[PDB]
Amino acid sequence: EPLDVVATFSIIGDFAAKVGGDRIRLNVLVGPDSDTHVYEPRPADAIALAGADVVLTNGLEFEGFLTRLIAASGTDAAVATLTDGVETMEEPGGGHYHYIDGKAVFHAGAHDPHAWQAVPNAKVYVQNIAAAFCAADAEGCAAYQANAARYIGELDALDTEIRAAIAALPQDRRTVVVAHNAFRYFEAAYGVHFLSPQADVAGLIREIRARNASAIFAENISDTRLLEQIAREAGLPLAGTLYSDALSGPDGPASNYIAMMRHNAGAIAAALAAR
Ligand code: NA
């Protein structure tokens, strides 16, 4: 058309670009290394949304803001929630029951947004994107769909590579530490454990000793100070940085999703193979 596509943040942006190729014009609302967790609304998001045909989002959190700006523009854009069809996990402790009409009804409360850290989930994202584009632009559907199938083949190879790396590790060396745990879907998919803070460093320290955790990793979401406290108290070496919610810049080590995951998985395995 070009199909005008807005993606809320860099990782989804990469997916969009892979699916859309030259048929789309892509704007990404939150770019690499921003001091934002995943996505956060900004008024200037309006300028991109107002021209849009399709808006790609992670989840339901700020779909209010996005759809209110879309209505105000008079645009009529399809909003695709890319976690549709992903088995999302609740945040630790999130649940609770409410006694509606006699029955104790469970209320989910706040899902962990970091679903891309499991590569089978990134396949669903990509499949949802091709569906949304295929939909808004019937003529492009064969191209989107061939782009999607080929990227999904590469994701499949990546998921096997990650599994082959982790499977080579000893069974008693599977635990690392982070100040902020953006990695619960990685832990659910692959054979590794992440400990993070849930005075209470003491609790964490005990589980660290109990699990013989090998290393600590930095990430962009926690502040810096907490990380230094924990390593100091635990006497664990700082092995590197894991990419959680954003790609790196184009000269960094995580300039697209595949490279991001290669990095994370490779750095984790390196630390566990030796620390
Ligand atoms: Na971030």
Tell me the DSSP string of 113-160: --GGGSHHHHHHHHHHHHHHHHHH-GGGHHHHHHHHHHHHHHHHHHHH
Tell me how long the chain is: 275
Tokens of 144: 């989107």
CB-CB contact of 6 with 30 (8 Å): no
Helix (H) or strand (E) holding 216, with range, is strand 215-218
CA–CA gap between residue 117 and residue 188 (Å, rounded): 9
Residues in contact with 94: Cβ distance below 8 Å, sequence separation at least 6, in sequence order: 108, 109, 110, 111
CA–CA gap between residue 32 and residue 17 (Å, rounded): 15
Distance 140 CA to ligand 1 centre (A): 33
CA–CA gap between residue 229 and residue 200 (Å, rounded): 12
Distance 221 CA to ligand 1 centre (A): 6
Distance 88 CA to ligand 1 centre (A): 20
Distance 166 CA to ligand 1 centre (A): 26
CA distances in angstroms from 34 to 57, 78, 113, 221, 245, listed in the order given: 17, 26, 17, 10, 10
Bond into 2 cis (ω within 30)? yes
CA 110 to chain centre: 15
CA distances in angstroms from 95 to 40, 110, 111, listed in the order given: 24, 9, 10
Phi-psi region of 234 (alpha: psi -120 to 50; beta: other; left: phi over 0): alpha
Phi first, then psi, for residue 266 (nearest 5°) are -70, -40
CA dihedral of 139, 142, 146, 152, whole degrees rounded to 10? 80
Distance 138 CA to ligand 1 centre (A): 34
CB-CB contact of 111 with 90 (8 Å): yes
CA–CA gap between residue 29 and residue 183 (Å, rounded): 23
Distance 201 CA to ligand 1 centre (A): 23
From the annotation, which residues make up the binding site? Answer: 37, 114, 180, 245
Helices and strands in the chain, H and E counts: 9, 10
Distance 246 CA to ligand 1 centre (A): 6
Distance 76 CA to ligand 1 centre (A): 29
CA–CA gap between residue 197 and residue 178 (Å, rounded): 8
CA–CA gap between residue 27 and residue 216 (Å, rounded): 35
Question: Each residue of 105-124: b (16+ CB within 10 Å) or e?
Answer: eeeeeebbbbbbbbbebbbb
Residue entry with tokens 């939909």: 135
Annotated resolution, angstroms:
2.0
CA–CA gap between residue 183 and residue 227 (Å, rounded): 16
From the annotation, which residues make up the binding site for Zn(2+)? Answer: 37, 114, 180, 245
Domains annotated on the chain, with CATH: 1-155 (3.40.50.1980), 158-275 (3.40.50.1980)
CA–CA gap between residue 246 and residue 34 (Å, rounded): 8
Residue entry with tokens 């054979």: 191
CB-CB contact of 80 with 54 (8 Å): yes
Tokens of 76: 């009529």
In 3-state terms, the chain is what percent helix, strand and coil (to 5)? 45, 15, 40
Residue 213: beta bridge partners? none
Distance 45 CA to ligand 1 centre (A): 17
Which residue spans within 18-71 are E strands per DSSP?
A: 24-30, 54-57
| Method of determination used here | X-ray
CA dihedral of 24, 28, 31, 35, whole degrees rounded to 10? -170
DSSP 237-275: -EEEE---SSPPPTTSS-SSHHHHHHHHHHHHHHHHHH-
CA–CA gap between residue 255 and residue 253 (Å, rounded): 6
